[PDB]
Design a protein around this ligand. Structure first.
Ligand SMILES: Nc1ncnc2c1ncn2[C@@H]1O[C@H](COP(=O)(O)OP(=O)(O)O)[C@@H](O)[C@H]1O
Ligand SMILES: Nc1ncnc2c1ncn2[C@@H]1O[C@H](COP(=O)(O)OP(=O)(O)O)[C@@H](O)[C@H]1O
Ligand SMILES: Nc1ncnc2c1ncn2[C@@H]1O[C@H](COP(=O)(O)OP(=O)(O)O)[C@@H](O)[C@H]1O
Ligand SMILES: Nc1ncnc2c1ncn2[C@@H]1O[C@H](COP(=O)(O)OP(=O)(O)O)[C@@H](O)[C@H]1O
Ligand SMILES: Nc1ncnc2c1ncn2[C@@H]1O[C@H](COP(=O)(O)OP(=O)(O)O)[C@@H](O)[C@H]1O
Ligand SMILES: Nc1ncnc2c1ncn2[C@@H]1O[C@H](COP(=O)(O)OP(=O)(O)O)[C@@H](O)[C@H]1O
Ligand SMILES: O=P(O)(O)OC[C@H]1O[C@](O)(COP(=O)(O)O)[C@@H](O)[C@@H]1O
Ligand SMILES: O=P(O)(O)OC[C@H]1O[C@](O)(COP(=O)(O)O)[C@@H](O)[C@@H]1O
Ligand SMILES: O=P(O)(O)OC[C@H]1O[C@](O)(COP(=O)(O)O)[C@@H](O)[C@@H]1O
Ligand SMILES: O=P(O)(O)OC[C@H]1O[C@](O)(CO)[C@@H](O)[C@@H]1O
Ligand SMILES: O=P(O)(O)OC[C@H]1O[C@](O)(CO)[C@@H](O)[C@@H]1O
Lengths: 741, 741, 111
């Protein structure tokens, strides 16, 4: 489908994840049939030419998808800014016949790339004038197409909600924070942390929100005058009220109202002078620029490389330079120039002290996250003292994140003045009582623990419905906020159709989807999915290393997730599995013969290794032992085979940054939705919830949050397979089969 | 065997692992029958008394073993130095009736504790004089017993090799270094790393050796005059000779000949001024003082905690205060004072600029490590250019550490002027040729990658022995260094036994044991065991968190190890398993019934979970599915059960600190012994090696390195099951059982 | 099998590695096939045999029988064949497995 050549480079500040993007672009460029060239040392080697530019084969980008940084340098060039460097680079490209380029880096690198594009024609004219090239060559390569990628941990590119590599940087910052928090709680010492980021406070805020830090500094919202006294009051209140440790996070470019940078040494001197608490400071440095890339990072980096290659092949000279970014939950494509000038407009906005205008220009999500952070950071004295009574339940299997969500919900409810109860062991608990009131201090520190300390059970409510109604009437509970998996959705549904028989079930209930399988309808991601994918990715990478150690071997892996195939597909994408067998993609024996022939052919190459996943219930009869026997027999003399079953190790340890933050966001928003619905449905001195809109599942759709009624989702659920009728992630399977030979 | 009370506390700089120490002490104290109290906030709460000291049950120390820092505070006290605070603490202890006390922390805390033992009688006299206590109480508590545990990552304590937590600090350091190396290679940047260690460079030395850094600065061997020229020469040589990045490590106590501190800022200014290379400086901060402790930290803390309990209960008043330390791989016991003055004298000698005397006082092991690091850091110009040739093999299952040993052996061999070959695919390749010489630069970066790059196979030599001898004669090989598992030892044994039938096999053969199962005879640790222990440690902790998520659950985990239960036993100790089944400990059905009823007893308590480790072939009929059926049957109505198989995940990813160091040290010392014997047996112009001492297995014995003849080990090897007759780790099974109820 | 129409049986006869017993009993009972060590077979032969069963199930004789010596192949277990025949034969017939164990040693000796 193509007959032209491709060039690729990464430039600017390295962010872990470029390796997956460069792998994807080169592998599609080969798969589509185009020629691909790797530019070493970035713009330095592009200008130098010669050995700095070289053709690559299908195997050139192997054994890098799990590696941070980049294999091709991405060094900063000075001659590129000059006319002589640009014409030399154009001379090198025409000598190698490069007409489409992919660039990875920051805003300046792409600005320079588009500057190079805007005068490519002029460069060809004077290059012909000096006699270096013939006019026929200039006519052949008369146009240059640019596709851009944003690789930077700062996440300052306002046109993209998530830049490549930030999730991995979020993993590195938080594991450092977790190590620091242990000694901080031990010694009762207040600490100041310095996170990376040129002039952006996204990383500082996300880390503080995911760690419950007692105070934050960001450039987007500089502190108001007299912040010293408010700092002293808050830290005194925290350490007095049982908070053993205090965490302070400061972006390297944090400023005051006058824009003057606030040095961490000043903050340390102030806290020591005014409180005398023992304290330290730890500058983290370049730790955010390294480590293994996150599974979401690898998936997104590969997907952006997929779209960049497609954009380059389908672009025209009249088409302006374009970048691929994220809007909602799809790979959108935006013009480079418009994002550049809007970023510069936000930059002058924060420079010109019009901080609010910079805030609205960049976006409205992070100001709301900052509002949630200030709400939950400290106990604001509640005044409402509303008669509403709420209960929180854990249902389903254990998963990463429910702890943060319940912590968010209880603290928000106490802030709202409601009486909050917490039920242990879910519906089985409610039948057997086991209900206690909770306080603000009673939930501290839950943000950093995986699983659910409250516990969960697979019991459904209809078996003990009478005891549930009795306990509801005894304790006067007026709302439910179940956080759990598919079984939570089933239980809430059964309660909904039970409303006609039992009048007390005319109550408001909401479900927070939390399960590793990601099979709860009404959402596009379930809380705890990302932790499970990260665990499976690490484990499969370790299996890949073991297989590569003993060459000519293949591994069978049995990933969990019931009938849903999301976990299998994302793991296979992250670790480059040669195939992923899934229930939604039926396959017969001839397909396995084809895959066996693929592996036998690949065994002739230098990369003599293989890894094929299998969702645990992808096929009724073709169990994992089937695949082991078939591969071992048909591959006799060529390779051997082994089996693995990733057990409950896929349920993860410490939760991930996105899961912690997403659980806190859903807990707050669900509590606001409850308080809303309760204050409408209260009439004549009693709560009466009969409309189906009183039973909804809070979830993040393609763009933002929604509240779909549970009964409305009944027409979109396969209760036999316990998974929704249609799922959005089926597109990624084409990508998974693409990235393998 | 006790009718008294035990007290525990932690003081000084927190070093992650005190949770394991207090767990083992508390659980051993309860098992022996002595009451146990947890003294919070260290010596501050000790003097304060009251609520700061409270009794602990078996469940008081549950679910803390995997936590960094400490759960009992460890605050610093000032009145503890004053006699008023001392008498107040003594009053608190006699009021709670505690006669024995276990101290955890650094040297100063031990000095204070010995002062307490030295004046306990005077304090009780003062309390009786003022009327606080009766005469009978004074007679009852007339003596105090002190047992000290050296918990400090600095590893300054002279009489001990490993203090509690130093391995965890090395784990933190190397996680950070592996993160940094990606971006440092990407941007071609030099990084100056500041390491902790109050006045010792052990952590700096071990990190530099395990990272292959370009230059090191420690206090034990301060740099000679004009060292800056050597800095410029080495850094220019590395950057010119293919070294993409440069790493410089500095101890926080680094000094010059005059003892003046060397600032990392100075080193950055010097390298920038004299070379202009882009560079950075990173300070790890207090990240090393927290985080989840590594597996070696937990096992070491548990053994020292048990030994401290034993020491306290077997002590007498005439006996002086003693501690528990490491000699070889056993818990030896030393007197407190002698080590204290030895450490003080070493510090004084370092301050007095007698740096040679300080080096001799630390121990010859450090000096040998310094010499090994100097030998391997840069390529010294060889001059001998002998006629000898060498071949290196990888055999057995791939184990994390083979690459480090191969790199060290190759570079040491190049230094001695021998031509060294590397045979891919083990003995199979040696029959199939594939033998290639290797240069210095050809093995760069192997230290930091797991697996086996040469490739390993389980094939044995006797099947292709004619082709083996043909290739030996063609390449003129004069010795083999076969690093590998039991298959390596068996293959070299076959070649030695075949020396009678052919002449060419009269050739010196050295074996480096490298296998996760730790079954090669003649050694105590096999290269790569520690990585597998740690990998299984994380896996089991993740399973236990999932288990606690679903209250009332038990897990059956099947771990590798061939027949040796070393891996299963140490992992079970690492994660507090209820029982670990192993071939070396025969078990019938009655023991399983006994374990089940014990599990039901535990399930009546608050901690409603469980875990059992099964070696992969601990029993020929009782497979893991049998155990699942038995447990799910006899626990019906009380709990459920699950099974997980840690397959090739137990081979681990990046090797841990000890495995990199152990691989490097074995590679150097094995190559030196090989060159020594090869020069010994060369006579009249032809090599001829017939005596049994010409074939040995390098291994770390109880104390230090020794070369055991390969044939002599035959009488201490079980070729039926592939493991030695006797193993040293059988004592650890007693710890595993006693620490569980 | 003939009683419950549309059914196939995988019979794992004894005999060690020798397939004399599996062959001759297959002739004596008209089995559809008798997999034996002396005749190595791959997945293609099993696919063909499934295809013969698929065609044969359209006729009046809606039954089948395939033998297998107990150790006729290292990997293709009787469970593997049961899964293969049931899966690729979905919608037309079902399958069951049997193991003629020490019944093969027989009762009273024949004349
Ligand atoms: N305005 C520009 N015009 C031409 N080239 C540019 C421009 N800005 C950046 N570049 C090129 O990209 C390289 C990196 O730029 P830098 O400011 O360091 O970070 P980034 O490009 O990621 O924003 C520069 O060395 C230069 O070669
Ligand atoms: N946890 C926090 N982190 C950072 N800034 C905070 C935090 N809490 C409050 N602030 C800021 O300090 C000021 C006082 O807090 P605020 O929420 O306004 O309380 P009040 O309603 O009494 O004025 C505000 O400007 C707020 O933005
Ligand atoms: N690690 C991740 N895993 C899955 N999805 C993610 C991840 N990070 C970001 N996203 C998606 O991109 C969005 C970025 O989140 P953000 O803009 O910070 O605010 P919010 O999540 O509240 O919308 C997320 O909402 C999510 O849809
Ligand atoms: N020789 C001593 N006599 C009395 N108290 C001491 C002595 N040494 C230390 N202490 C006290 O015990 C604690 C441990 O001392 P510190 O210097 O903080 O760390 P470390 O002793 O582990 O090196 C401190 O609170 C100290 O005041
Ligand atoms: N790779 C290195 N890392 C750290 N220090 C080094 C290194 N190489 C040399 N030095 C320091 O410079 C000194 C000179 O090295 P040395 O082994 O004495 O070489 P030579 O004796 O042949 O001149 C060493 O004693 C050491 O202190
Ligand atoms: N992580 C570990 N695992 C197993 N044993 C260890 C570990 N760390 C230390 N040891 C034991 O203490 C010794 C530490 O050796 P060290 O003091 O660094 O000098 P050297 O390696 O030259 O002998 C090791 O040989 C080993 O016996
Ligand atoms: O993913 P679901 O269907 O909500 O069920 C949750 C659990 O069920 C499992 O199958 C395992 O169940 P258990 O952990 O209870 O044994 C996993 O897919 C998952 O951890
Ligand atoms: O058995 P050895 O040679 O002592 O080495 C241990 C290896 O053997 C194993 O059992 C590997 O088994 P495989 O034959 O399937 O590779 C693991 O315990 C481990 O990887
Ligand atoms: O068949 P062989 O190998 O000649 O040995 C005789 C017996 O061995 C068998 O395999 C039966 O094995 P077992 O009686 O030990 O279970 C049959 O072939 C036969 O009944
Ligand atoms: O040492 P470096 O790489 O120049 O880091 C400084 C710059 O790196 C960045 O993180 C680039 O993303 C910026 O925040 C910062 O200005
Ligand atoms: O909080 P502290 O006691 O000052 O600890 C920092 C100093 O002690 C150490 O932690 C020793 O372990 C060093 O890292 C440092 O010199």
């Amino acid at each position: 489908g193509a007959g032209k050549a491709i060039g690729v480079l990464t430039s600017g500040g390295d962010a872990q994840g470029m390796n997956a993007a460069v792998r994807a672009v080169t592998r599609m460029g080969i798969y589509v049939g185009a020629k691909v060239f790797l530019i070493y040392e970035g713009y330095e080697g592009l200008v130098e030419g010669g050995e700095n530019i070289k053709q690559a084969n299908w195997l050139s980008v192997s054994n890098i998808i799990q590696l941070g940084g980049t294999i091709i340098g991405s060094a900063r060039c000075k001659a590129f800014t000059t006319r002589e460097g640009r014409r030399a680079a154009a001379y090198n490209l025409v000598q190698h016949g490069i007409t489409n380029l992919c660039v990875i880096g920051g805003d300046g690198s792409l600005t320079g790339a588009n500057i190079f594009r805007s005068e490519w024609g002029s460069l060809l004219e004077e290059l012909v004038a000096e006699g270096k090239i013939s006019e026929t060559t200039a006519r052949t390569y008369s146009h240059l197409n640019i596709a851009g990628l944003v690789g930077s941990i700062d996440n300052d590119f306002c046109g993209t909600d998530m830049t490549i590599g930030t999730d991995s940087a979020l993993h590195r910052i938080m594991e450092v924070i977790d190590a620091i928090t242990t000694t901080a709680q031990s010694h009762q010492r207040t600490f100041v942390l310095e996170v990376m980021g040129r002039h952006c406070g996204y990383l500082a805020l996300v880390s503080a929100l995911a760690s419950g830090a007692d105070w934050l500094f960001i450039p987007e919202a500089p502190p108001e005058d007299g912040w010293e006294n408010f700092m002293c009051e808050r830290l005194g209140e925290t350490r007095s009220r049982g908070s053993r440790l205090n965490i302070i996070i400061i972006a390297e470019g944090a400023i005051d109202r006058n824009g003057k940078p606030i040095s961490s040494s000043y903050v340390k001197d102030l806290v020591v002078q005014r409180l005398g608490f023992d304290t330290r400071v730890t500058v983290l440095g370049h730790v955010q620029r390294g480590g293994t890339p996150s599974a979401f990072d690898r998936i997104l980096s590969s997907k952006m490389g997929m779209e960049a290659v497609m954009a380059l092949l389908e672009a025209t000279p009249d088409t302006p330079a374009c970048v691929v970014t994220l809007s909602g939950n799809q790979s959108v494509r935006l013009p480079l120039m418009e994002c550049v000038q809007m970023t510069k407009e936000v930059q002058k906005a924060m420079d010109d002290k019009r901080f609010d205008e910079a805030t609205q220009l960049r976006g409205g999500s992070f100001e709301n996250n900052w509002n949630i952070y200030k709400l939950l950071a400290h106990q604001k004295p509640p005044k409402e003292k509303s008669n509403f009574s709420l209960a929180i339940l854990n249902v389903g299997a254990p998963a990463a994140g429910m702890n943060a969500a319940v912590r968010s919900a209880v603290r928000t409810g106490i802030s709202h003045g409601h009486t909050v109860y917490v039920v242990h062991d879910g519906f089985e608990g409610l039948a057997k009582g086991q209900v206690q009131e909770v306080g603000w201090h009673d939930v501290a520190g839950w943000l950093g623990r995986g699983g659910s300390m409250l516990g969960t059970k697979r019991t459904l409510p209809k078996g003990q419905l009478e005891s549930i109604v009795e306990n509801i009437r005894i304790y006067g509970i007026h709302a439910l906020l179940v956080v759990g998996g598919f079984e939570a959705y089933e239980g809430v549904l059964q309660l909904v159709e039970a409303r006609g028989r039992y009048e007390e079930l005319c109550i408001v209930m909401c479900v927070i989807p939390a399960t590793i399988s990601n099979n709860v309808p009404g959402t596009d991601f379930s809380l705890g999915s990302d932790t499970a994918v990260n665990a499976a990715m690490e484990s499969c990478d370790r299996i890949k290393q073991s297989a590569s150690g003993t060459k000519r071997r293949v591994f069978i892996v049995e990933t969990m997730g019931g009938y849903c195939g999301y976990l299998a597909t994302v793991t296979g994408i992250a670790v480059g599995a040669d195939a992923a067998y899934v229930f939604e993609d039926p396959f017969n024996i001839h397909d396995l013969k084809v895959n066996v022939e693929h592996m036998t052919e690949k065994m002739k190459t230098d990369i003599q290794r293989g890894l094929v996943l299998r969702n645990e219930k992808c096929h009724d009869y073709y169990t994992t032992e089937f695949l082991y026997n078939l591969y071992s027999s048909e591959g006799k003399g060529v390779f051997d085979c082994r089996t693995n079953v990733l057990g409950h190790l896929q349920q993860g340890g410490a939760p991930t940054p996105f899961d912690r933050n997403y659980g806190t966001k859903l807990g707050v928003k669900a509590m606001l939705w409850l308080s809303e619905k309760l204050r409408e449905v209260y009439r004549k001195g009693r709560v009466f919830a009969n409309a189906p809109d009183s039973a909804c599942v809070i979830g993040l759709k393609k763009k933002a949050v929604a509240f779909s009624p549970v009964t409305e989702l009944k027409k979109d659920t396969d209760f036999e397979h316990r998974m929704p009728r249609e799922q959005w992630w089926l597109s990624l399977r084409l990508m998974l089969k693409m990235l393998a030979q």
